[PDB]
Amino acid sequence: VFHKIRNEDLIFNESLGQGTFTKIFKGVRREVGDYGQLHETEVLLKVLDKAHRNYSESFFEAASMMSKLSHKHLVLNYGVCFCGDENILVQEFVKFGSLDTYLKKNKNCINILWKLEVAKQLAAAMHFLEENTLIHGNVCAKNILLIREEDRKTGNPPFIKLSDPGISITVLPKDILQERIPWVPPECIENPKNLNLATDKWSFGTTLWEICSGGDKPLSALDSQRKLQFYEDRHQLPAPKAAELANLINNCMDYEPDHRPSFRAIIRDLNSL
């Protein structure tokens, strides 16, 4: 599965900032629907950096994976454009953007039932991938996207969706993998080729730390080299100020790779609170 979209059917509107070796843009895809009616659609346009064109293989292996999947809490991928010289991904556009900047903007206005439901939606998608023995590899708060904000008056919850895996950590330089600590599991630092279903659970715990602290970045004050010793010393994550979900964060972030519980178990612990 690898749909192709013509460059003449994609318009580029506003930029949305840089990213992990990519550049983000809002745009419109003009497609022809039934009865001969053109059907414009707001889309997300993820352009790979031309300077890093060597990562085009994993850049497209990420799109081929998400185009095969249909889940409520997964960002849909419409296709791929070879728009001129650049390689571009076309995805479902979410209105409210990244979750990490949403937690930081409304840090004191986010109830704990809000964070609990968001964690349920994220754990739902991770259970779907685990059920279908699929590995994500880049589960972080910056990749989580909010399509609907909380509306207690209507009774509908907030709605989050996880984006594409992006560039796999197996092909990233050792310089860049150490700077991703503690999102990269400890076993992947000593051996980048140890990608596993258990590696996502570690990132799920690190992401649960982000939402529980309100957008704060763990180990941000530490440089790349001190992060490397953080793992060798077997240090655990300092519990956030709220200190609610911190008990579950420690279980998901266990240094033994096979001790990480399944997401069917995690879904139970979130409903038991």
The binding site for ligand 35R (CB under 6 A) comprises 16, 19, 24, 44, 75, 91-94, 96-98, 142, 145, 163
Closest separation in Å from C-beta 89 to ligand 35R: 8
- The DSSP element (H or E) to which 213 belongs, if any, is helix 197-213
The torsion of the CA quartet 192, 194, 197, 202, rounded to 10 degrees, works out to -60
Question: 122 vs 248, which CB is nearer to ligand 35R?
Answer: 122
Which C-beta is closer to ligand 35R: that of 41 or that of 250?
41
**Toward ligand 35R, which CB reaches closer, 98 or 207?**
98
In whole angstroms, how close is the CB of 217 to ligand 35R at the nearest point? 15
Question: Which residue of the chain is nearest ligand 35R when measured via CB?
Answer: 97
Q: In degrees rounded to 5, what are phi and psi of residue 124?
A: -65, -45
Least distance to ligand 35R, CB of residue 207, Å: 14
> Among residues 12, 4, 172, which one has the least CA distance to residue 87?
4
Structure tokens at 81: 């454009």
Smallest gap from residue 271 Cβ to ligand 35R (A) = 28
**Nearer to ligand 35R among residue 122 and residue 189 (C-beta):** 122
DSSP string, 140-190: -TTTEEEEE--BTTTTBPPEEEE----S-GGGS-HHHHHHTTTTS-HHHHH
